[model samples]
Target: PDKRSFREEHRIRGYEVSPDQRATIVTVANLLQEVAGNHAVGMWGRTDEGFASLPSMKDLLFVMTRLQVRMYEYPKWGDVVAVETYFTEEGRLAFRREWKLMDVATGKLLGAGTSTWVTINTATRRLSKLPEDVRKRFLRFAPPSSVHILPPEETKKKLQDMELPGQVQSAQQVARRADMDMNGHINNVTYLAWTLESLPERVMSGGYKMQEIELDFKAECTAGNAIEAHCNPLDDHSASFVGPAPDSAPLYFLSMLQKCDENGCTELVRARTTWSRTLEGAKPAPPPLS
Candidate 1:
């Protein structure tokens, strides 16, 4: 009868995340990856449930790669992470799932995120209008609210304008690691970490928060590949950078604008990233991490 209650507990495989916090984020991401595979053929696939299938960080951020599957029909990604997930009853057919991202070691609340998904016909690929039994089960544990919305129109314009040349600044790294995920190539998240780490201590200490960021993934990055992160200031409050893949075309492009407080801590105002594949006709490499 599929009468299992919607308010269920799912614990993720945990790991140590310190200094960089990449591993912790990866641990959460991996849990989502597994969940995604199970739900890929179902509705919640567009929610955090389906993000579990992405093998690389690039697959997670870039819209093009995700479009290969129908579950995620739109171009959207959320920085919000979930510490827990459960369903709640809002109305007859309306239910919600609420969760938040917390610091694994310190238990510090980082962010809160949520989503709403309705089951539909897999064959017809249309809204199923959820049956009563299914609705009852889900409503029992529906979370408190919905997830934050990612602005599209304004974010798109920022990405388009990021291509303009800016003053090159001294590049400094904020994070580093040796072992990395190879998503059929180097994981896209690794590149993101590099992009963030490459920011000079001056910028980070200067109180600039990543306001907006957009990234496009072109190719996979493999382990043992030495990569470079470059940064340029667009203005006092804005900056941009490109993370180049080793011996290949640029892997991802990132732009961030920040506002600093007196203490040098950043208050990100806007950020965006755009990804592109290696130029056509370029030779493709063997599967990464093989």
Candidate 2:
């Protein structure tokens, strides 16, 4: 296992936690989309319908525009963790993976992510490209170690709309039917759980804990459409946060999930989390079992 990455290992169940049993950022974005679909069906030795019956990925529809996690720790409820994933090449239209999540028994680091993908037109849904022999057969199974765990391009701070303040705003939401996704859109972790459904209650009651997120899928939400998430509080007004106490050092937010009607809103997704304020059940001691 010297690169060409793809580790795996999961085991953190009990409904993938969150009543602070940890592990939930949509269960680490569904284990990085199940280890990026098992690292593309184990680098195309195929099966997952033979890697979508590759003939240069049969008509294409890859998607996932961007996502970026960074969670220092989060792996409980029978934790076993350990992802790994890998991919590169994000130039001629896009491709970037990079997960990492560790701690299968103390390899520590329980989070790190990065994503970016592209290729659409499963019949003119537009944007498509990837077939220079399928981009060198998927960049010859990349991984020559350019080491990157979130931060290959967008380094935060670009989620605007009248510059953050208290803001809030949610409640139109609908788009269920299990958030439609055999690619009919509406599932980028369900617009990241609708940008944490309008956060604020000091970042969701048990006071802060999403170390860093970043999303940006900007456009696409079908099945009964009608989204709407909006959050602000990127701290200004001389460093916001009043009910302070959990040491208050991290905060920062900016969500946005539009879709409104009559040709008005249309955004879809755009985030930039960063919470922190811990201490409600702190949790961290778990490495010993050999």
Candidate 3:
């Protein structure tokens, strides 16, 4: 066929939203990855092919380097939504993944995202090009719809130059076995969870909800690595996290409202979080994605 698309459906749940009855940005992040996982596992053959052959094939890892999401609207409690993802080969070392969210009944677009990923070698712990055998299948599933939020180099440059807003907040975490993925680095979802968990108690108690997130993963942290989650409040409603900063480590670097390079610290992942509202149900919802 000239055109190809794969669709998956999900219902918004109470556990997935905030007190104001709308989906939280993290919830969308989870589902976005969920459907993509489904594609990798079932839609494709990641699961069908057992890990037994991984060593022989030398294609055993998949990891996302960055995610950019634009939430045009939030699905409320009990709202059902459909998500579609398409893969586009960026080059041998990287690939592009784009997603669209739609209202189940109205078929209205709710949100969209663009992300980049690079596969890796499990043994060497280095990035690898997507194998041709698998790339052919990915090409067969490719749809015309795609979004390039930014060029890979530009994405990294912007992240490096970006600034965090308020006094930098700091905390510590240990990379436990549970946090590791098949490739041994902390899973992407776990990285998001770590960022969410590091938010100040004051922010969590203030009834804020996330509206958008931009995470640029810089390096991998495996079991036994110490993690310092440091963040700067952009304002009363927004904040950014650039992985960990060693506790009590004396470091003098310009903290612009930012982290292009988090010096003297492990750069596992960098995140910029925007709070949509205080969740009093006071603010107007964004218009549906066109």
Candidate 4:
């Protein structure tokens, strides 16, 4: 097999699109993870555990800590999307992955993103670093100069600070058994959608499309735990790039998900999203890979 990054073409299915007939951001996230896993399977030749089959990764799960997505355009249902994924290192401890989504037919950019992950013990549920062998396995596939869709240096500071205040609208949901992934915690792909459910219909129907999103996972939410999603508008200066619109809900907003139990509330995920009225011709061209 060629020693190159993994790329797969996927025809967007009906369930991957939203009511607007365009692929949802969540779908982009799902595809990214799927392709990454496929790449791992290729490298390790493990049908059962894939990436986790590495010696040090035993009993450790690669849990997402942060993800930043920049969407240039949204692929509609039935559209063929070319997804490319590759692994990189964040220093010696954390692992970073980058993704590029393009329209298979037109070759136009659709979306691109990068996510950061750290290993956690399955039983102890505590974060830990992989041993030397695992690092060697990952470096075998990393690009010589490294590549980033959403550059980590620029997005790291922005994604910090899990605190969000002045919650204007909120929604509550109890984590269900189905929400738990094989890792025994709520899936990271579901966090953005869960946060969006709390937004008012004004924003949902407001003809806006998410242009950029930054997600930070704080804690885990398990089955039967009551989680609250909160949304608040950000001021002009705090907005990533796009600011608020006049006489309407702000295009930039902050979302936080908290899990409440007898021990009080624990923040689960904090996110910042920038939206635009038009999907295309809004932002500059996607950043070129390194």
Candidate 5:
């Protein structure tokens, strides 16, 4: 059953949002991260009021990853198995889960989201299917009887072909202390901070504000791991970064849309995000942000 009164506390990272929009969006993301998990883990949604602007696809994926990491436990080498999710008719509880990198973000409508999740056990590192209770809870609130099935196919190829918006000059490794949750791996939220820090002083001083952002986490980033943040300029006002996994393909992509003041300073922070999932051809209902 969905809990209408669930609430959680979160802190602001104090990045910057000239008109107070960035802080509020961060808070919304934080709140959603706290509420949207299953008994073991889930992800929550923020009212449209909390959205400075609609969240980008990349940002949504970032929120989803945070929800997964918080609600579930994984053994070393465990791979995500699957994720299934759906939204309530009354627009209350929206659900999402994933197994692997299967779909790209190009095709979909905008409304609420639903997904299913599965993971592998690495120590034994074998695929583990969803437990009965988890499966039952998800099916309880399936879409209305009249709604038609809408499973969209994954993109034909990796989104790497899209021209990036800007360039990343450099990046610093995450410190041990930055790894909260005692999980040894750097917390997903910290990535936002790292991305912001990587922004050039010129960009920061230019008075540009984040209009939107999209972020995706493909693999775990642990303490002492060196990450190269590469940027490709999209336009004068927006840019993106790709966080490549140490030994694998790009693990995450973060895109930021921004606006600059007359003085060339950041005025807003707009972010979007996506993830790599194996559930190809499955699409969640359109999110309000889309």
Candidate 6:
């Protein structure tokens, strides 16, 4: 807790959960991202690199690399949840952030995450350096992660080596206007929702629920981009999500979703999701969320 951290509370709505259910996986993902965005709004507005001044600065900070989320519990409708994020350092090129989500009614942790981000130059659309003072100010914190995601090199290798994805769980999606954020594109969290949606009903129905998710965003998908999502089921409990294929545009822009062995297998991002089945079911925390 030595470094900078922020917390925000959100109310879960009926629509965010399924019929007669608690929260859905997408709802949890959205809440985590909403809190992160909320942190940026309050934290940046008061900093020298204020949101109002970012346009003229020519450098746009973005989340470039990875996100890993571990879900422990689900907040139900009418429940109040607290979300918190800590600013940490990872080398200089990647900004590290960590989060914790808790049910306010019981003070139990619902989820936690670790993410990597980068500063990009708007003009060149390339990696940029963070101001020295800003970097130094937030480098002291890194609360331990429950499980670390694969390194970029390993992730890239696994994605490339993946054979043609066999099962097409879900076909396609078009970026919606609602998916847009201050970044002028589909926010990174939208990809998480899209991937989770690809899971078969068997994995999502009844007592089965998402336990962990690891994602590597290969390219950015903008508003109106066509995305086809694929799931290569490793087993009933685990699957790999293949995002949109590479298109005619530069590598940074993504294309349609297709089989990995296909010529245009330019994935927007590759993700691995694991599901947990329990008799107590998705409604209760595995470890009491302590």
Number of the top-ranking candidate, with lDDT as the measure = 4
Query: Model 2, stretches more than 4 Å misplaced?
Result: 1-63, 66-70, 74-85, 88-96, 101-107, 114-116, 120-125, 143-167, 170-198, 204-206, 211-216, 220-255, 259-263, 270-290
User: Candidate 5 — which residues are off by over 4 angstroms?
Assistant: 1-27, 37-118, 122-127, 132-134, 138-158, 161-166, 200-208, 235-290
Off by over 4 Å in 1: 1-148, 158-183, 238-290
Give me candidate 6's TM-score against the actual structure: 0.74
> Model 4: per-residue lDDT, tens digit, 130-196?
8887678678777743456665566665653534543444656878899866646577787777876
- How well does model 5 score by local distance difference test? 0.33
- Cα RMSDs, all models: 17.2, 15.5, 8.2, 4.3, 16.4, 8.7
Q: Tens-digit lDDT track for model 5 on 18-136?
A: 34233322333333333344312323244333321222221322123212211111111212112223332312222343212112233221112223222434344334443445435
User: What digit string (tens of lDDT, one per residue) describes model 1 on residues 201-271?
Assistant: 54433333332244433333343433434445444323332222133222222343222234442312122
* Clash counts for the predictions, in order: 39, 0, 7, 0, 88, 3
Overall lDDT per candidate, in order of appearance = 0.33, 0.71, 0.61, 0.74, 0.33, 0.60
lDDT of 3 by residue, 89-197 (tens): 7767777787777787777677777787887776786877766877676667664333343334444324534344425444556768976656444567777766665
Cα-based TM-score, every candidate: 0.37, 0.34, 0.70, 0.85, 0.44, 0.74
Instruction: Tell me, by TM-score, which candidate is best.
Output: 4
Which run of 10 residues does model 3 get worst, by summed lDDT? Answer: 249-258
Flag regions of model 6 displaced more than 4 Å. 1-3, 46-57, 137-161, 235-265, 279-290
Which of the two candidates, 1 or 6, achieves a greater TM-score against the reference?
A: 6
Worst 10 residues of 4 by lDDT: 281-290
Q: 265, model 1: CA deviation in Å?
A: 33
Lowest lDDT sum, 10 consecutive residues, model 1, at 67-76
